[PDB]
Write a protein that binds this ligand. Structure first.
Ligand SMILES: O=C(NCc1cccc(-n2ncc(-c3cc4cnccc4[nH]3)c2O)c1)[C@@H](O)CO
Ligand SMILES: [Ca+2]
Ligand SMILES: [Cl-]
Lengths: 247, 56
């Protein structure tokens, strides 16, 4: 995250850190005790699908404080329409091997109904994006979780104000090079507040970090609500990676 | 009251029905109050609320 602030510990309790062989891979968003939403492209180069870990309740990567909860990732589900190394349909649904325990530091973000998200949440101007990604373009990643308030653009306006955005994406952020999500943040939440509750509206996608003349691009979660809900009602299948028909 | 305008007055989710009829609904872990619009938590850790801020 470029140009944000530290998310005070416990104020982003849905944020997930994904690790592969102990190394930072991507962010994610907890939506229930066993389900995490992330970005498909995070998994383009995974060799050993059995060494993927999700961490909840994380804050400062330099220390252990006892609020962290780690789980093996049992399933990574990716839409059939996603093509590796591209941006469209950049979403993944992850099943944890065992539920996390909800606590003051571990709480799911609400996955909204499609109608509500399209009719109401899509018109809330500002939303929060968070992660442990790069603090600067070509810079080091963050040790404490960072958060940034970004305004959403209608796609017509994003194209005009920009010095390929599909119906499965939206733009948000700033064109002045000061504030953006960055490498290391992909998969994390774009969270929208409405009448006292926060909802998942976007996933940090890729990929140009706080580049003048350009906005951040986010996966438009509203397009995937029904796809996600059907998969969460399904039984697990052997083998970690599952490609599931979309729509 | 239509769901497209002002969320139908609903705090959370809204369904249009046959006639001048609307029903609000709440996410799992919430219940709808007798006003027909407001949602109140029914569990300790409902989705989308920040415990350290709700306690403060
Ligand atoms: O192609 C690959 N796929 C894997 C893989 C995994 C995990 C992460 C990345 N990955 N690389 C770059 C970015 C990224 C840039 C960016 C700008 N603005 C907002 C969010 C942004 N994210 C990113 O998320 C790739 C490589 O691994 C090639 O080796
Ligand atoms: Ca820690
Ligand atoms: Cl586990």
């Amino acid at each position: 995250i470029v140009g944000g602030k530290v998310c005070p510990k416990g104020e982003c309790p849905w944020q997930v850190l994904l690790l592969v062989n102990g190394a930072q891979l991507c962010g994610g968003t907890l939506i229930n005790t066993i389900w995490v939403v992330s970005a498909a492209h995070c998994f383009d180069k995974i060799k050993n699908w059995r060494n993927l870990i999700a961490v909840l309740g994380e804050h400062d990567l330099s220390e252990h404080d006892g609020d962290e909860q780690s789980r093996r990732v049992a399933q990574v589900i990716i839409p059939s329409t996603y093509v590796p190394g591209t941006t469209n349909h950049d979403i993944a649904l992850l099943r944890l091997h065992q539920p996390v325990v909800l606590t003051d530091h571990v709480v799911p973000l609400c996955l909204p109904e499609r109608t509500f998200s399209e009719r109401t949440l899509a018109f809330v101007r500002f939303s929060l994006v968070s992660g442990w990604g790069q603090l600067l373009d070509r810079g080091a990643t963050a040790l404490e979780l960072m958060v940034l308030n970004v305004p959403r653009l209608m796609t017509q306006d994003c194209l005009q104000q920009s010095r390929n955005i599909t119906e499965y994406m939206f733009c948000a952020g700033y064109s002045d090079g000061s504030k953006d999500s960055c490498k290391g943040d992909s998969g994390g939440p774009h969270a929208t507040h409405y009448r006292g509750t926060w909802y998942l509206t976007g996933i940090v996608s890729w990929g140009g970090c706080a580049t003048v003349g350009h906005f951040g691009v986010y996966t438009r979660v509203s397009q995937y609500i029904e796809w996600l809900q059907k998969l969460m009602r399904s039984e697990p299948r052997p083998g970690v990676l599952l490609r599931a028909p979309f729509p | 009251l239509i769901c497209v305008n002002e969320n139908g007055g609903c705090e959370q989710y809204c369904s249009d029905h046959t006639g001048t009829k609307r029903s609000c609904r709440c996410h799992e872990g919430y219940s709808l109050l007798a006003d027909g619009v407001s949602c109140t938590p029914t569990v300790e850790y409902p989705c989308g609320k920040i415990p350290i801020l709700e306690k403060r």
